[PDB]
Design a protein around this nucleic acid. Structure first.
Lengths: 91, 139, 24
RNA sequence: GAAGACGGUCGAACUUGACUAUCUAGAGGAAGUAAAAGUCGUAACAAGGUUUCCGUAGGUAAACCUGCGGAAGGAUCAUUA
RNA sequence: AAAGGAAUUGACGGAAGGGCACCACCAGGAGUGGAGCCUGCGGCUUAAUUUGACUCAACACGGGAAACCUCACCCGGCCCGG
RNA sequence: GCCGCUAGAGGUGAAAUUCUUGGACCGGCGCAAGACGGACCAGAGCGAAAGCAUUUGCCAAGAAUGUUUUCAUUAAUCAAGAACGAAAGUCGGAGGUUCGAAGACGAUCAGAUACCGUCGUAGUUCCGACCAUAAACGAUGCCGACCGGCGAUGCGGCGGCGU
RNA sequence: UGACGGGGAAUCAGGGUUCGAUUCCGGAGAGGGAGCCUGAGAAACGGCUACCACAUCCAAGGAAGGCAGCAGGCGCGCAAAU
């Protein structure tokens, strides 16, 4: 198994117009390769999303439509979790 | 254009013998697979034992909760869903009773406004629901 | 659904089914 | 002139092999058509905002997108010596 | 318990072509928008800052320029005109 | 490849990725490579349908018309069966100029792993061996008969002033 | 094949379609299969011999079985008489 993740993971969700929301993740890992786990993010959460390239930052993945809770479902289902590092910024 | 000569009776009859199978009532009543999947097996009624009482909502333009029962048949052991017809005729039924279940009136198709239910209950414990309903007999 | 892509998706489904059935 | 007995035949039945119908318990696992106040977007109908669709081949959460050949059910029945 | 075919009227278009109008531009004038002030509306506070109206078809509009009545609104009390 | 000028070329709604003082784009004379056959080209032609376009050959084949030629019903449609069948595709070989799925980048957008640009593999190209599907469309089976007109067009034949 | 065959039945304009286990004829079988005795006539079962299957009485040494005859009860059933 590869190395454990770095110190903290932040999930930020913001709004766009109508009935829609635009949700981000921040700071998963710098060590972890295969950062095209958007492909596993999109195909499990049933959402359109991608990674946009932000400098000196945590390789933000933006997904459309509200999943804060489904990230909690998926990350305890998979290896990388301690379940005290995930701070929810939902409104 | 048809084959219409004088010695051509075999072509006409072995045509119409084979294009009768594209007719749906002839295929559904003469192939034999309908009689094995039907819960009655070609009967008019079937006696069975009430498992559990359900309510099913009507289809989309109506709004009601139709009172029905889940019956398990004695004869072959399959489980059906039957509709207990009149007003207040749900209350005359205890569970684990013999009921005599007839079809709903459209011969294998399940319609009304009630989805997936084609059976209705005639009797409960050898007294019929008309006699129980009018106050002519008792339990 | 455009019927060619319904055809293509049942084509992919049958190709995966015949992949999973001849392992044994 | 009875029982029995060698042999002969007709031969039910049991024995271990097959193979082949009909129904049944099937842990999982993959699909539907309804229910229609869930979520993600708009692919189709207006030149539906990239004209649609057919055959095939590759890809992608998803409608779909792109290639090469074909059709108008097209958005032209026609455009000049 | 319809799915579909052809055809008519209508609505709609991110189609093609005409027409009208100073609630359109062009010829142009006084302006408005920047400035102090009356006044309405959005917010903010209040015990209350009552209220309807939000693109022409809201915002000097309720003929609404209210010191009491108006007067709905607040704080305290009489009153049957039960 | 050789010249001989120069600071931009390309591309787009706008741009950026790409190329360029080791000399690009444009101009000139040349060589070679592979694909392709414009304009003439039409509601015109041929083919069983798929399809088919530079010249001159050679190889067989065919509709139409003309016929006082011959045979004398040999015919129509087609279970079984077979031949061909665009493009994509698969395998073996040769070829590779351009286009171009997958892919790598750029930019448009909230997001586009789509349209829009730069480059590119497999393929497109040819010779063999497969596959037999298309909106393979006149969305209209084939043979025969009968039933109004009209003016041209392709081919073959006949008859008519003229030019 | 929820198939005994036929004379026939219910529908029916002409054509058809469907049904016929059923009182008349013809076949087949008496739980499943065999094999026989007598007799003119049987592969008889209100005859016999076994095997299979299921069942009754027993002093556990043995004995006897066959309603798809009329009535009747069990059971299966929506569904059939003294």
């Amino acid at each position: 198994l590869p190395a454990g993740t770095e110190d903290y993971i932040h999930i930020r969700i913001q709004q766009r117009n109508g009935r829609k929301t635009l949700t981000t993740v921040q700071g998963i890992a710098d060590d972890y390769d295969k950062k095209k786990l958007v492909k596993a993010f999109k195909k499990k959460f049933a959402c359109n999303g991608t990674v946009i390239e932000h400098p000196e930052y945590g390789e933000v993945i933006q997904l459309q439509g509200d999943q804060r809770k489904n990230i909690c479902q998926f990350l305890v289902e998979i290896g990388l979790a301690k379940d005290d590092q995930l701070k929810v910024h939902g409104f | 254009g048809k084959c219409r000569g004088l010695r051509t009776a075999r072509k006409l009859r072995s045509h119409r013998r084979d294009q009768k199978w594209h007719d749906k009532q002839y295929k559904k009543a003469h192939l034999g697979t309908a009689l094995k999947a039907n819960p009655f097996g070609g009967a008019s009624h079937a006696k069975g034992i009430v498992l559990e009482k359900v309510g099913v909502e009507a289809k989309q333009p109506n709004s009601a909760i139709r009172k029905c029962v889940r019956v398990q048949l004695i004869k072959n052991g399959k489980k059906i869903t039957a509709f207990v017809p009149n007003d207040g005729c749900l209350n005359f039924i205890e569970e684990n009773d013999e009921v005599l279940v007839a079809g709903f009136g459209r011969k294998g198709h399940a319609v009304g406004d009630i989805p997936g239910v084609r059976f209705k209950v005639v009797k409960v414990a050898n007294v019929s629901l008309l006699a129980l309903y009018k106050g002519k007999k008792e339990r | 659904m455009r019927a060619k892509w319904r055809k293509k998706r049942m084509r992919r489904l049958k190709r995966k089914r015949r992949k999973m059935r001849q392992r044994s």
